[model samples]
Each structure stands twice: as structure tokens, then as C-alpha cells.
Target: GRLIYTAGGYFRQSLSYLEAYNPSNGSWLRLADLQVPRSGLAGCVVGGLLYAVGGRNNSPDGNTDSSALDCYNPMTNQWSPCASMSVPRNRIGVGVIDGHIYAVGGSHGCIHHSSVERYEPERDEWHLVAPMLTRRIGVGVAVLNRLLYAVGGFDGTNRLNSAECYYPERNEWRMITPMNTIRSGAGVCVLHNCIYAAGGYDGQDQLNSVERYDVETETWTFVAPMRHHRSALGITVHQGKIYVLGGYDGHTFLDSVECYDPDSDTWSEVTRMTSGRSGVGVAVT
Candidate 1:
């Protein structure tokens, strides 16, 4: 079983599946394309369903994109449209907690936003939730415990390091430890109790640096850097390891893949992907 992620934009919208490594020989296979072509989207997996949130067809230079939600089920190998968002957004962040998916801040055209929304699969409706303290784009979202954490992103003009966690129980956002380097378009995931922010652009250049957020201490600490500078990357935790997928390097798009093991605090190289891109929404099936 696998969760195949594919983004639209520079590359055509296509689906591919990653074979569960470690337990078996790692391999990739094609799945199904999205109902609509989009890029810079956000994704999260709740139960066995994979949901892809809003995004744009082209660049986010200046456009009022749709906040339409698209969902895919591995069992059916099909894509179906879901509820529309209250506000249209692109380059957003998303995470799943308590059977609900949280769609975080993103930009509508050039205007950065701080709004958050939640989608109920059973009802197939979207409801406005508590907005983030900071209005940003390209945020990295992950779930730990019962809280949804929104990490690094750009605030319209410049990249930011601010971090905030949303408590579904109280429907509020609380400021937390910030990343060491201010960046946007990074990949984020929780391996243990720490949130790992990896491979993003820091305004002028692409970053290979990896930063870890300690939930207990409420602080961010430096970790091993990535081998390749990547921005707008995709990350997921599979088989007890965190894997970083395709992203852009300012000059060119990349198909490289890498994995990190917290047990050793080290990174290892993996096979390259068939396509090259950035700003992809990834999920596990």
C-alpha cells in the first residue's frame, strides 16, 4: 500500500505511488491524476483518504484561485471533488487531526492571509476555524499529539521563521518556537516528538539546512543539513523515516529524493524521481 502524490504546474498532473520501503524493495508505480490541474497545493491524509487542498494552475503572481478540495482514495484509485473553501487560497499548508483536515494560511493572488479552515469528510462541508496569528504563505504543516502546527513561511514580502500551533479543542492559535533560519516553501513532518523543517528557499537562495523543533522545550535546534538545496519540497514519514521529495533549486527543478533517520541524526541518499518539480502536496495512503 502507498500514497501517491503529484503536483501540477511546470509538470503535468500525474500520480505515482511509492512502495513501502524497508519492509520490501522500494519501488514506484503510477496511480491516477487529479480531477483538476493545480500546483502549490496542500495535502493531508485522514483515515485512509488523501485530501488535496486549494492551489493554482499557473504561478501565484496575481489570481483569485479556487479553494476547491479534491480527494483520492487508494481503494478506488479515483479522485472526487469535495467541499469548497470559504476563501480561495494557494501555496497553503495542511494537516490532519482527530479525523478532520486543517487547511492553513496561504495567498490569494498577492495578498497573504492568516485564515484557517476545517473540512468534515462525513458532512462534506467546510467551516471557518481560528485564524493564525501570522499571515503567511508556503507554510509547512504537521500534526503532533492533538495539535496542528504551522511552521515557516513567507509573509507576502519576506520569508518568516514564526511558528504557531492550533488547538482544535479550544479553536485557537498559540505562538511557539520559531525556526532558526527564516524561510518559506519547506517540507515538514513529525518523526518522534520533534518537527523537522527541511529544504526551503531563504529569499536569495535555496537552502539545504534542516531545523528541528522541540515541543517539550518549545525551542528550535539545528540539525544535519540536506545534500541538495531544495525549495517547495514535499515530505512524509514512512517506515520509521522521513523522506524528502522533489523540489526546485532556484535555477532548476529537481527529482532527487533523500531520507533522514532520527535514530542516527543522519541523512541518506535515495533514488531520484522520474519528474522534477517543486511545491508539491504529499500524502500517505
Candidate 2:
């Protein structure tokens, strides 16, 4: 069975909830809560192991002691502590390339900067994440097969929307078509051979518009829009459809989910999450 997992997220309050979705039954199975409750952390799968990294362990962003890593084994169904990082970072972006778990850019909640830490699971250590030449805040990251993609975000003053694809073998990143002018904090994922970008902040207002990029033709086009204007939502592909989880709507926290099918070009609602959550971490196993 193909399953997707999402962990602790926040809307000012941090959480420890971990839930898994099975496409076969169309129900969310609440798994073990994160050992350390957190918000704005990065979640990714490495060789089938699920990991949660670098978010404030508690609700206070001032706490810098929770730059830690927790590993989950499906076989054991338990979360165990591992080597932890010393520094504190919030809203950390993560990507899986090859076997390495790259903890990309994050903010200190004050200055808002970037850093890289690659977790070498083999040695149970942290290092550097892959890169984009231009620095972006609130950038959306997606992994398709062995390749990782970084889509649009803010470049401090500008609403930067350029898309780039990274090649591990060559250690190179090349720019893809900037076709649809992406926005910051959009949930991006690959589905049906196309990259879908949905629900983001345009620096002016929250958006429900969705955009799709064609791998075969190297093109971009607007598609069916979601009903909620979600930002900082979690997105992933299970089976052939794209699921977008809870997000913030600038004023209220969102608990709704929207599932989009590329073949029919339609969007339908799924069961809402237990509570409203934004800045969530999602991965598939």
C-alpha cells in the first residue's frame, strides 16, 4: 500500500501529531506522536526511515535547544532520539537526494536567514543541504525520484518564482522554465509527470490558484484552483493524485485538505485533519 506521512506542524502552537494516509482505505491513521512536540520542522524519508529535524521543540520560538533529530522505524513503530544539532532553526525546508537527507534553509524568526545541514544517516550525523544560487525565504521544495526541485519564494524584496532542478551526479543545478511565476510558501509536488504548485502567498494576498509544469514539453499552465487560500501547507503524491494539507489563511489556521487529480483536472475535498496546522512537514514511505 502506498502511504504518505505528515508530522508536527504549527499555527503559533507546536504539535506532536503524526498521521499516515493510505490511499486504499481513504482514511488517516494516527500513528505515534512525535517524541518531542514541535512546529515548523523538516520531515523526509531516507531509505524508508522517517525523520523529523530542526524545529523548536516547544511553542516558543525563543527556545534554541530543540535543534534535534528524531528517527522513526516502521518496524518498531516508535520514535527514538539520535544525534542533535546545536543551533535552532524554524520552518526548515528538507529534501532527499540519493541517500542523504538535506536540511535546507531555515529562519531564526528574527533575522530570517538560511543554512544547510545534510544528515548522513549511515553515520547518524548532520552536514550540508543542496543549494540554489539565489537565496530565497519560504521556498517550496519537492523531490521526484532521485532529483530534487526548489520552486519560488521571496528574495527579501522581490517575489522570486524561478524553478531549479538539482543533479546529484554532476553536482549541478539548472534553471527550468519560470513559466507560471511562482509565489512563496506554495506546496509543490510531482504528479503524473508534471510539477504542481498550489496555495501560496503572493506578498499581497493568500492564493488558491494552482499551476502545473510539463516535463515533456517544458511548459507551465494554470489549472484547477483549490477552495482555500492555503499557505505553508504540506503537499505530496500518493498513487496518482496530489493531496494538499492544512495551511494558514493569513487570519485563521486551516484543517482542510484538497486532493487534485491530473487526469480529470478536478479537485475534491478530503477529511479535515484533527486540528488546524500550518508549516507542516510531509514525506511518503
Candidate 3:
């Protein structure tokens, strides 16, 4: 009963699409569409429900950032709207910890932001949380060892290599060991108390480089790179393997997919997606 889900992205245009992949059978199934077309959205699953947070609706002039929050129930094959955020954003960092969803740094139109917000599904409400130390867009965020981590992203002026962690008990965010390579739009996931950061743009070019962080030691070490350079991709851990999904590779949108086996320190290509997309949201269940 394992599944990988990818939702909402831009190909040549913004999308409201959703799909799920079953590795057990190596099959991809098209699911229900999102409530609205969006790109640069943040997604996570909390208590069996999939939540899609702030993102931009496709606009001809490119000025539509969204505060829209939508939740999906696979059991019902339905999508429903939830309370929106305090601020509109896209290209954000999102993570789930202790049944709450955290939406971190992202872009508001052209402005980079450091604002953080948390969602309470029980009340269907959202509240402000401690802000990140730096304003960023295209950030990679995940929860490892009960702490929230914000990884490399664009800080308006430059691609960033810095990282930070949040202590929920203290309600504070503290800087952590920076990544070896500057990145934005990277995919991040937690596996066995370690965090893995993979593929993004480095200001000049898209990247295939990957790195791993040990929570106990506060250190980062380089890992085997992916076969294809990807930015704005989606990543998740399934059965001890890391799956990297669709994204842009400098020149074109990609449907190519691959997985990294930490046990072997190697990456192998997987079933490519039916649609080429980037800036997609992914989850596993």
C-alpha cells in the first residue's frame, strides 16, 4: 500500500492537475485536478489529508500570487478549500511536523519574504509563526528529528547556500550549517534521521548535485548526483529509496524521473511522467 503523488506544475502553462504513482506495479494514475491552476505551490500530507498551499495562478502578465489553501482526500477523490494564508506567496518551503503544516519563505510577486505560517486543520485556521532569518524563494524545507529545516534558496540578490532550523518549543529559528553549493528550487526529504537535498539552479545553471545532512552532527556531505539536472523538482522517500520527479533542466520541461538508493549510493532512472512539468508538489503515503 505505497503511493507517490505529484500535484500542480507548469509545463508551457500553469496546471491544476494531479497524479499518483504506485511503485508496486510501476504504474502512474491520473487523479482529480486541483481546485485552481497554480505553479510554485507548496504541498504536504498531515493526518492522511494532502494540503496544497500558496502558489501563483497563471496570469498573462505574471502578477498573480495566491494565498489559496486546498486540501485533498484520496479516500473521497475530492478537493476542498481551506482558510487562506495571511500573505500571498509562491515558490515556498513547506513541511509537516506534529500534525501541523508550516509554510516558510517564498516569493510574493517579485518580493522575497521571510514570513512563516502554520495551519491547524482541526480549526481550519492559519496563524503566523517565527520568521526565517533570511528572505528566500524556492527554498527546500523538511522536518528531521522533530525540528523544521529551511535549506538553500534564492534570496532576491543571490542563490543561497545557507540553512536554518526552527525549535518549536522555543519558537525560534536558528542558522545551521550551510550547503556546499548554492541552490534554489531544490527538492528535500527526510530518511532515517537524515535530510537529503537534491538538484536545483545555482544562479548560472541547473544542478544534478545532491547532498545529505546528519541531524545529530549538524554536518552536510556530498552524495552521488542525479543523471539529469533539475530545478523546481519534487522529491520523497518511499521504501528507503529517494524519488526525484519532474522539473525544468535549463532548456526544457522534463518528464524524466529517477530514484536514489542511499544504501547503494547510486541513482537509477524510473518511469517518466506522462506530462513534462516543473515546480510540482509531491507526497508519499
How many clashes does each candidate structure show, in the order listed? 0, 2, 0
lDDT of 2: 0.77
In TM-score terms, candidate 1 sits at 0.92
lDDT values, one for every candidate = 0.79, 0.77, 0.89
Model 2 vs truth, CA RMSD: 2.5
> Global lDDT for candidate 3?
0.89
State the lDDT of candidate 2 residue by residue for 1-285, as single tens digits.
757788988856788889987767778888999977787776788888888877765456545425778998877889999787545556666777778876655555453444556678889887654556655567777777677777787666677678777776676677888846558888887786677889888878888999988866888899989989988888888778888989898888899888898889898987788788987788889
Task: Rank the candidate models, highest lDDT first.
Answer: 3, 1, 2
After superposition, the stretches of candidate 3 with alpha carbons farther than 4 Å from their true spots are 61-63
Badly placed stretches (over 4 Å) of model 1 are 1-4, 7-9, 12-23, 59-64
lDDT of 3 by residue, 80-102 (tens): 99999998889988998889989
Model 1: how far residue 237 lies from native, Å: 0.5
TM-score pick, better of 1 and 3:
3
Q: Which model scores highest in TM-score?
A: 3
**How many backbone clashes can be found in candidate 1?**
0
The predicted structure with the larger lDDT, 1 or 2, is: 1
Identify the leading candidate in terms of lDDT: 3
TM-score result, candidate 2: 0.88
Ten contiguous residues with the weakest lDDT in model 2: 107-116
